[PDB]
Write a protein that binds this ligand. Sequence first.
Ligand code: FE
Ligand code: FE
Length: 656
Amino acid sequence: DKTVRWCAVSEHEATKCQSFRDHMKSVIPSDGPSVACVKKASYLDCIRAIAANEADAVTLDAGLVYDAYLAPNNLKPVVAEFYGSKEDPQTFYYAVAVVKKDSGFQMNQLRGKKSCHTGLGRSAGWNIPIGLLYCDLPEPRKPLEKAVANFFSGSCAPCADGTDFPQLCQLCPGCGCSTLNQYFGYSGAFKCLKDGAGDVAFVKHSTIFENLANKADRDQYELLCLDNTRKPVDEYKDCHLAQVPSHTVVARSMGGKEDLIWELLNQAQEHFGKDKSKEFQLFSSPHGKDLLFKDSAHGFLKVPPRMDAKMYLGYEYVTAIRNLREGTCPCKPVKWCALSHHERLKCDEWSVNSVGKIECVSAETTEDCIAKIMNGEADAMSLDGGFVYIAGKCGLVPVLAENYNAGYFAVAVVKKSASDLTWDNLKGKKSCHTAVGRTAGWNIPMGLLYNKINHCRFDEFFSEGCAPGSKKDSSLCKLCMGSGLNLCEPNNKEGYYGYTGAFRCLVEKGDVAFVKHQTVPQNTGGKNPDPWAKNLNEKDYELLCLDGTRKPVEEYANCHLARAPNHAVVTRKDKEACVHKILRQQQHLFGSNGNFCLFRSETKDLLFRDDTVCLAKLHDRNTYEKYLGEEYVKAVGNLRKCSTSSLLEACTFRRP
Ligand SMILES: [Fe+3]
Ligand SMILES: [Fe+3]
């Protein structure tokens, strides 16, 4: 059967669900999803029923989304409620810490300040801020109210026990738990700040815009960022305490039925959603308010399938709720993320030589390791500039850059015998790329090509080619040499993948290869002993300049497509300082100094490139926008209209 068993937590919800089930069977045909309704006593009972394969779906708050993720439940977000409008769908809200401009303190200086909270037990006003500040609170940290009462000098914490902790009600005596208290709720907490009662108000990002119409008044307020800096109130997406999803449908991570749940809800909103004017309304009911879904909801959005709960909730939110539930308080070792057996063996050797300073975790793909750095399972890894873009769009920052001597040169190599090829038109020619999304093989060459054809459908511009990472049926996979599953894969099991692989593709099948300036010299003249490269002479290959002219391989300095940003190490902002220090201390111990160490591989370019001489600092360029540059980001923004990165789709869902 294609039945979705929806879980209700009340008798009113079960009645609406039964009405939901009956009306669906009128609009959905024979081969479509049907609804069944399981009634449980609580949200947690619904979570257990779904984990026990007794139900399939339920819509939860963010805190319960975290509960549904923990073992042995292992549920994941599948469908999202959005609000506001269908043209500007609102799925998340941001918990922010608002202060007055020029008040002179940062997030790590809140001790002794006066605080304004929407109310004890609320998300943006209490659970999230106190969660992030948990180990800053004095010991003993339980009961939590007493620890907060000895952190802030005075507060307005509505509904707190002012009898035992009167400091929590200094700004609103009695801590009135109703709108009779002027500083209660979403608006009252900000009024507590606006009226000068407190120094910081923990509210939602939208609270400031609902209480201050003129931007001139909003310019008198700032937000506290977790990096201990301040930003204007309209930059909350780059300066919040946590990004929080409002209402989320969850399901089993394995066993589904995700596709069925979305097909059901998508057809449900098409027939009974907002402004559908039927007898049955998906987002209201005569039996009660907010049954199954919020009455204020406007519809549903499908959660990208790469998304898990920790990625959906976000690193900041998970940190805050973990502290509140576990109560665990300790520069710590840096956890490197390896992508292969030989990369893991190298890191494992690096870790013991570190005597603890470095540790290793492994993942199967580059995107998987990036996700581990995002949620905290891993700490750092080095990436091509194309992945720095993805890592940046997902919230990570670069901390150090690989230096080989301004970065390396992206070149277009062609066979010199074919003296007809020029950069001014390679249409209908066979191309070989390192991989889709990489700097030298894709972002730089195809970025310029986009400016002349105005579309990212490069498989109908070139006749065929090998671009690892393309859809298996693409014409840009026809030239690749991988066998079976490995064909066109962006990894080692595809022989045409990478700098060297793309040059081999040119030598054997292609017409033009997009690689870096040293690729041809180090793979010709016997330097590469493999049969495909052993007898190659580098004077038999040329580069395509932007002029439309061609020059020898060694003349790349005056015949390159563009300068490429160096490979860089990425990490979370909360570990930027510790990674910057430990790595620069380890390269002084194992850098350019069996014979070598860190910058040498048993195979080829493990963890770092082998031509790396140092790990250089970045100064202000600690941001993917400022590291890659405006032109690089603009080009990738043009190319993403044909992107197939599931990790980038998940992060773009949280921050378009
Ligand atoms: Fe609130
Ligand atoms: Fe690269």
